[PDB]
Symmetry: D4
Subunit: 217 residues, 8 copies
């Protein structure tokens, strides 16, 4: 198993920490706030109150031993930067960091952060795609032009067959799965039917999917 250290138990770092622990990884949870440590005590291997900008407190944690250190300190950009800097001077292999704004990203780039993350910004985009198009539940982008989309089927599609909805020739797309009442269907045959309020997973060019949406559903 790998060993992870997560500094900053916010909504983000807390989630990261809780989720890794659930996977059975050795995870060290670190926060300057005692109430936070108490909160996540139950969801990590070790939970320690510590100020990560204090180099002596850092050595006490033995943070040099970890292959992954996740800096999820947000509001205090000085703490985030200074922590990252210390971690870099300690030759930690992979240092992942949560960023607050463009300029925070840049300094983190310059001082040797390995992966920089913008949780809210990324989700904002995802959610906006949903707001604009009530049909989309979730999606993943293969590139700027191609995507896999999970659609909420309407009445227009009720009792329609996959061959009846020819997307491979008509729209250059392919249906990958159907989810009905919780039961899942993968790579359905040309004879398989779709009913309304099912989850329909389609793959193809974005504009072509939007076209299938406007005309098909």
């Amino acid at each position: 198993n790998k060993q992870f250290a997560v500094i900053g138990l916010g909504k983000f770092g807390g989630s990261i920490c809780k989720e890794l622990h659930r996977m059975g990884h050795e995870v060290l949870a670190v926060d300057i706030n005692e109430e936070k440590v108490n909160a996540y005590a139950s969801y990590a291997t070790h939970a320690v109150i510590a100020n990560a900008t204090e180099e002596n407190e850092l050595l006490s944690l033995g943070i040099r031993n970890f292959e992954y250190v996740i800096v999820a300190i947000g509001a205090n950009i000085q703490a985030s930067t200074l922590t990252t800097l210390l971690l870099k001077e300690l030759d930690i292999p992979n240092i992942w960091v949560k960023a607050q704004n463009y300029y925070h990203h840049k300094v983190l780039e310059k001082i040797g952060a390995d992966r920089i993350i913008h949780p809210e910004k990324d989700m904002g985009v995802k959610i906006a795609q949903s707001l604009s198009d009530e049909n989309v539940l979730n999606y993943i982008d293969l590139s700027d032009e191609y995507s896999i989309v999970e659609l909420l089927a309407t009445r227009k599609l009720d009792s329609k067959s996959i061959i009846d909805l020819n997307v491979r020739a008509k729209y250059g797309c392919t249906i990958l799965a159907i989810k009905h009442h919780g039961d899942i269907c993968l790579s359905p045959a040309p004879e398989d039917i779709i009913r309304e309020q099912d989850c329909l997973v389609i793959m193809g060019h974005k504009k072509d999917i939007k076209r299938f949406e406007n005309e098909g559903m």
Copy 2:
């Protein structure tokens, strides 16, 4: 003429707003802080300084015209709650709200929020899946048991064929796409090759995909 309003220009609400505007929608940006309003002025149809807990200022915005209002107020849970309440009493069709913790989600549920979002929590999970398994670039869950995953191909897969990597019989999975040097390939034929550092899109059972990772790549 659909109209979206975004109250609270944080990292989350800001992204949504900026993103909605980019798609060419009518978007109203709203914040109590003037500096925020000045900032997103360039990324919205209209931007207005306003306190969203004040019913009068709310009516003044012409909020009646909007079908969607996104409450992206974070730190101040009271402001978020009261805003949602006011919006609900003004009979706004769809109210989407950013939640801070479990209990904030509960009250928003009870006072009639139409969609509740936890951006940081959701990305924390996603990022953790990446941390444990450096191979995963991005993924989407079809159900509790099934997922679609985009993998960064290793040397073990370099110059290997789709039939050579028999996954449909060997692992019960199916390859959906290959991305090489930027060029994209959909529903690749049995003869198609994979090169190292390409993107490979695989669909199947979570456990079966992970097995392919351990043994296949």
Copy 3:
């Protein structure tokens, strides 16, 4: 005996608590402030310093055991709401709450508060009726139209008899009691006399009482 828990020892909750204890009920007084607990220590069965928004501290009090929980937290609406929410998730039979404004009342309604109280507002109305009409000492409303009123008798009524003041036929009212020098007279006979500065208790339609007041006294 029933068991009561009172969270928030303000002027209101303090009064509630002190008065119940005087009646010989098992009452638990709860406040986050130590000085408050010390103040009401002498007026409750148990007095405990506790933060009622902390679910663990709540379970420690054993608050699930109580049939009545009175939330008399005022200034901090977030604390009041969150406390009520926790109490509801603990399936407490009767949760009574002090409200700060209209919108605070609404959320408390929505999250399952059983009785909501506005001590100041109710008293404001009562006192205003006194300010407008110096004759009224106290009253109770039977409905929007009918009331029982305690009047301070003037000189105009000095040495007048109940039959001399025919209210049952002249004003459609009835005299219920006379209080003289502290001595009380209930359901006085037609021959009983009233002297000035006595307390006179009359029942009837509000406008009819006001008429008795304008013309009679």
Copy 4:
């Protein structure tokens, strides 16, 4: 032309003011906070931003014209005290003041407050009487020993007659009114019936009424 002024638009002073205005009296609303003044502007003849501890601002209001001034300043005991003092030195006939604690009552007493009110304390007692005895809706005390009480009739009293519920001989009390489905009955005849969930108004000794509750209903 009686003139009332209300200084301090809290929940208490606000209610009074709003209520006085509703009765069609000349009312002046006064507060140091502008937002409060804007709020009760709609519920007063005139509303003025003013600091009531400033003698000059006080004279500017034309406070000389008012016969009644209500000091509903709460948190800031110094402001309340100083205001009352100033009003007294300006020879205002009637000064009613909201008290925070025993000692605030004492000083207001000594510096010549005409009426001192403890809204929260008074309602706390009232509400406690309701808590212990779910039957009591509202009541009024005639003396330390005698009271008039409005009861919510139970099934034990459903379809029972006034003579059947002989209370004048059995409990030494008298029934004053019955409220059924909204309809009101005053001084009901011996043949009048009571149905469940009706309101029953009883007069007598506190102990005698409570006995009727235990045995009668």
Copy 5:
């Protein structure tokens, strides 16, 4: 000996306390601030940290035992008033208090303060008399019209005799003493001489002294 308690060790109360102790009186020094108590520990019989508004802490000091209690609390008028009120309810014979402004004096009057003092105001007047008239070192007023004045002798008076300066007939005044080089002369004979920069003590009507000053010196 008498027993004194001094609450509030400011410049004033500190001076009072230090000076009484020097006279060999039993003095209790009281302050809420620990650093103050430490400062005056060396200048009082007993020095105790205490909040004088807390009735229990007051009884612990045994403050009922003292014939004199000096309230020298200044900035916090609420503390000063409330302390005085408590002391009065404890039937303390002589309660002397330091006042901040006219209205503070009035309430202190009303709640039964025995002597009220304005140290700065009184000194301001004294010093102003010095500023206007550089000749006056110190003085005492016998009434609005008569005074005893200590003057700094100028050159105009050098080598002048008391008979040479006839003040009893010319100005209706009398010389009471001469201070030369530190040596003091009381009730000097008509033959006694005054030299410059001596201290000359004169008694008479104020205007007459000013006249002696303008014309004589």
Copy 6:
């Protein structure tokens, strides 16, 4: 045309200023707080809002014209010090300053303050002399050993004569004046009488006066 300026309208500086104005002198009132300036506007020739630590604002006042400047700044020792320094560097003839503690006196001494005053300390001593000896109304010290004292005559002295109270031989003191019912008597003859509650002005050695108090009155 003498000109006085008073910087710092505290209780001390305010009194001086008000008092100087009353004597008909040209007085300039100066304070950083606008509310203070508005207050003493009525009690000064001119009143100006100004920060006295700012050399420019100081010159703007035309402070060059003043022969006397009184620094009555208290709480902020830095402001007092810096003001005095600036005044001294602007070659103001006489700078009188209010001191907060021993060390503030020392620095003001070193930076050339012309007179240093400790109003509270000085009155504390005076008041203490009154506390120990209720007989003393007011007094003035001629030296370390000699004083002039105004006594409130007791019954022991009622209706007694000056020769009957032989103090010049018996106690080595001399009676300087008698004040009866407001009427004043200077250098009273041997036949003059003293009545109770009169004011008696005695001069002599401190110890001799105190003896007369113990034995004489």
Copy 7:
């Protein structure tokens, strides 16, 4: 036409700015605090209130025209860092920055600061050399081993000659100048005399100079 801009008018940035202006250079003074700007207005070509972390305000200054920008922001490390970053992204040739601590120096290094200065640290060293050795007035280091030092000549050297103080052979040092009563002598001849309290400028090895001090002077 070289243009210098100084952001942050602290003791350091202020001196630079004032000094650059004195040499007759085009200098722009920049600070977020208005009072600072008003102060150095007289010592700069132009002085502008501006927040230097705001890219827009920065462009508005015409900062593109400047070849040198000095960041003399101290307490707020974030402001200093962000300013430097912005300047670097605006392609300013030379960015000199004042550092607060080791780590601030490191980040400024990484984000491309052209010169980093530690004024206080550098003077601390210099002053310490003066403290240990009262003889040294000022010095400059040529390397880790060699220095040029200005000494205050003692009596031991009074009236002594350069050949008499043979330092080139005896101590391996050379005398570079003598300053007597203000008059200066460069590369003095073997016959030149030194008098006490003159300034003597010596060059050599640090250890050799110190030896000359112990034995020579």
Copy 8:
């Protein structure tokens, strides 16, 4: 060895302290802040948390024993002044102090400070000379007119000989040393060569050096 006490461990005092300790002197480090003491604990003989304005804490340190006390307290001018004052009243031989502004210097002068220092201001000037003239690395002033300068040699001087650059006759200057690749050359002969990017140390009149710079390099 001498004994030094350094009060105020800032960038300045910290540097002073660290540097003296490195020289092997007995140094006492003093700061009110615990974190500071911990920081410099490793760089001083004794390190003590103390408030230097508290005369008792000062005596506890035994500060009377030291020949040198360095007051390096900056932001708090009151602390700096008051400390210096106390040290002076304790008859400490040499008290060196860090100054904040002109007026702070003046009071420190007046209360008997022995040496006053302005670290930032002095460095500001030095650095400004560098900004104006990129050739100057470092320098020392012998007087207002004469200086020793360390120059960064350009290409214009590459392979030039000292005789080729006749400065003694042409510019009235003399070359004192050459630093090449780290190797140092002192008092080089007329035949010695200079290469670019070497450090060249020249002595003479300032204007004459600037002339050598403009024309020579």
